[PDB]
Design a protein around this ligand. Structure first.
Ligand SMILES: CN(C)c1ccncc1
Ligand SMILES: [Zn+2]
Ligand SMILES: [Zn+2]
Ligand SMILES: [Zn+2]
Length: 459
């Protein structure tokens, strides 16, 4: 059971207003045929245009919410809305475009999907709240057939050109006019009571209904993300590497060790309360401090209430020493904290739009993160950049320009001249740090944190 059987039943109740008289008894096989597509008993990697919820979750980066609204059905113009915010008007003769024939509309569809998806995925998954017109409009911009490769590279083909009779992936499709072998899923098949807006609004107040097709497209994809990543969480699913994943993850581990090690040296806390991942390991294994772990899985819905994490009777006194919240999203951090909190607003190929202001961060695994809130950090301040090292000044074994920096906290800089080793290590650390910040991570610390207190660890 890898793909969705074409013989699976499709509930058509949601289609009977746009398609009156539709048979109650319906399979994907018959629905695809009714949409104007012929599959010809083809065993060539494309068994069904529709996919399972599990295959959709594996291809979340490909999700594009799609809705079609009747402007006035062969005689009337159609408003095509995408979760990218685009609205196109197709005539049969929040970006709003005036009515144009299908031959040009399809060129715009390929460009939009190629630019949105080339750095995210090898395919498109149209996320629907199917009522009829979206399904019957697909024959105007979609071509299907055997799985193919791009004419300019080894990636699978996602587009087709009637001008050249060739195929292309999202990276090589300039001037292409047809979406080739797209995938789709109808959220309405999952068993919901009531319309799209009533189900979406139960979990999200960020997406409104400005009564246009792209608003419905956005709501559909949001609802789909809520069902698959908020109320249902699967951390076993692995996602391909598409950017700086390994460098970001390595940088996170380097920054964590650096910051915690310096906080322990500067303020000598007798105890550290590590709150978060149940599989966490001591990030500063040589530190003197009493290390105490508290298990909390990543919150994917709302941020944890500090009252529930701490109270209800552990040192019991979290007020003693320091609290470490490394990607443990809480509503209001205590004043004695070291915090790393992912900023959901960050634009990147790893961070996809989420539910209720939250975002879906996809780096090896998928993590829906509650909306970033500046008020969570009222008892803390922003952690400034610094590099600290007590390692011996010794080159061992990359050309050089002398480093001068007030934030290179080393014996050699204390002594008036940064050595080659600490300058190389400083520049590597500054690069790792910048990578982590640009990925969306933000660092916060207790207000008494002062790097001036690190210089006296060189005596
Ligand atoms: C030396 N000094 C005043 C401090 C040491 C550690 N934390 C804060 C202040
Ligand atoms: Zn290509
Ligand atoms: Zn929403
Ligand atoms: Zn040095």
């Amino acid at each position: 059971p890898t793909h969705l059987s074409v013989d699976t039943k499709f509930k058509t109740e949601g289609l009977c207003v746009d398609i009156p008289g539709i048979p109650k008894d319906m399979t994907y096989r018959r629905l695809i045929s009714m949409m104007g597509f012929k599959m010809n008993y083809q065993v060539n990697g494309y068994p069904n245009m529709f996919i399972t919820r599990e295959e959709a979750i594996r291809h979340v980066r490909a999700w594009i919410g799609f809705d079609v609204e009747g402007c006035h059905g062969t005689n009337l113009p159609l408003q095509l809305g995408f979760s990218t915010g685009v609205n196109l008007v197709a005539v049969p003769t929040p970006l709003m475009y005036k009515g144009l024939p299908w031959n040009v509309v399809r060129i715009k569809i390929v460009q939009m999907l190629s630019d949105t998806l080339k750095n995210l995925s090898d395919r498109v998954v149209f996320v629907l709240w199917a009522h009829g017109f979206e399904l019957t409009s697909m024959k105007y911009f979609v071509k299907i057939g055997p799985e193919r490769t791009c004419c300019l590279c080894d990636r699978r083909a996602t587009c087709f050109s009637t001008a050249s009779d060739t195929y292309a992936c999202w990276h090589h499709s300039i001037g292409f006019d047809y979406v080739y072998n797209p995938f789709m899923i109808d959220v309405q098949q999952w068993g919901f009571t009531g319309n799209l807006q009533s189900n979406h609004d139960l979990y999200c107040q960020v997406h409104g209904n400005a009564h246009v097709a792209s608003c419905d497209a956005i709501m559909t994809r949001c609802l789909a993300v809520h069902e698959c990543f908020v109320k249902r969480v699967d951390w076993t699913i692995e996602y391909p590497i598409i950017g700086d994943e390994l460098k970001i993850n390595a940088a996170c581990r380097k920054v964590q060790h650096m910051v915690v090690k310096a906080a322990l040296l500067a303020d000598k806390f007798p105890v550290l309360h590590d709150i978060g991942n149940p599989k966490a390991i001591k990030c500063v294994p040589q530190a003197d401090v009493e290390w105490k772990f508290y298990d909390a899985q990543p919150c994917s819905d709302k941020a944890y209430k500090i009252e529930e994490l701490f109270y209800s009777y552990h040192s019991d006194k979290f007020t003693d020493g320091v609290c470490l919240f490394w990607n443990c999203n809480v509503d209001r951090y205590p004043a004695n904290s070291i915090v790393c909190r992912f900023d959901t607003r960050v634009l990147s190929n790893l961070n996809l739009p989420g539910c209720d202001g939250g975002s879906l961060y996809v780096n090896k695994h998928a993590f829906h993160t509650p909306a970033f809130d500046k008020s969570a950090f009222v008892n803390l301040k922003q952690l400034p950049f610094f590099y600290y090292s007590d390692s011996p000044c010794e080159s061992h074994g990359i050309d050089y320009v002398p480093l001068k920096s007030a934030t290179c906290i080393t014996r050699c800089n204390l002594g008036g001249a940064v050595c080659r080793h600490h300058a190389n290590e400083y520049r590597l650390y500054l690069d790792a740090y910048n990578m982590m910040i640009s990925a969306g991570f933000s660092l916060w610390v207790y207000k008494q944190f002062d790097t001036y207190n690190l210089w006296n660890t060189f005596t």
